[PDB]
């Protein structure tokens, strides 16, 4: 086509979605991790994670307001990944990299799994 | 902080939200324009438009599944702006610029209003 494109549009949309999350506006699901609860928007979770995409396209699960993750999932690792979903920023540190990579593998967030693998390989 | 950032994350999120819109997945509102109906996600509409942000933060309207726009709004102008919200791409043409600018002013999409004003000024 002959469209023009606003370079900062996608980033501005994501910043506003994160502002809605902060203020708990139109959040439609609670993700439960080892008795730690995280409110989010189903559409953002689906756009970022192969696992949530599969969950919320299921005819029965699409209607659930609460999702319980596998008990092996670390709440801090989940929190870091939820922040990444809404900001593009990943708080990757020596002390959390193993939990973050394990959580990203479970959530099916291929780009996060890739950078964790590379950061681990650099330290060996 | 000491975060790393994935450059293409915001664009990838928006592309996936547009794929959900195309497949009518988790759309939670119908926007009615001169008897033309457009399904969308409330959160994406709020992230892009000052008008929808005001509508869906209202305690009564946040619960509506149908929103009727002012009868002066042109369905094609709305369609072009809805496409822009989900893609960052604006199909601005000599034949639609007046309807697009009028719709963007009503929806409170300041960056679109800005480029329409500049494109009109260049043709005078």
């Amino acid at each position: 086509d002959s469209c023009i494109q606003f370079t900062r549009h996608a980033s501005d949309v994501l910043l506003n979605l994160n502002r809605l999350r902060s203020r708990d506006i139109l959040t439609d699901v609670v993700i439960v991790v080892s008795r730690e609860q995280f409110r989010a928007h189903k559409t953002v979770l689906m756009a970022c994670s192969g696992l949530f995409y599969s969950i919320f396209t299921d005819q029965l699960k699409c209607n659930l307001s609460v999702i319980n993750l596998d008990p092996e999932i670390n709440p801090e690792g989940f929190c870091i990944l939820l922040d990444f979903m809404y900001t593009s920023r990943l708080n990757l540190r020596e002390g959390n990299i193993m939990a973050v990579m394990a959580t990203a593998m479970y959530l099916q967030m291929e780009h996060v799994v890739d950078t964790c693998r590379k950061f681990i390989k650099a330290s060996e | 902080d000491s975060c790393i950032q994935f450059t293409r994350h915001a664009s990838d999120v928006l592309l996936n939200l547009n794929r959900l819109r195309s497949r009518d997945i988790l759309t939670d509102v119908v926007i009615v324009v001169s008897r033309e109906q457009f399904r969308a996600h409330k959160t994406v509409l709020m992230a892009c438009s000052g008008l929808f942000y005001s509508i869906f933060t209202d305690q009564l309207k946040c619960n509506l599944s149908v929103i009727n726009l002012d009868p002066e709004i042109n369905p094609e102008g709305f369609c072009i702006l809805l496409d822009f919200m989900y893609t960052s791409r604006l199909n601005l043409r000599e034949g639609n610029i007046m309807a697009v600018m009028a719709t963007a002013m009503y929806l409170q999409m300041e960056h679109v209003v800005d480029t329409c004003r500049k494109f009109i000024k260049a043709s005078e």
């Binding site: 606003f6 370079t7 | 791409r89």
Partner: peptide
């Protein structure tokens, strides 16, 4: 704004 840019030409994509």
């Amino acid at each position: 704004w840019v030409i994509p």
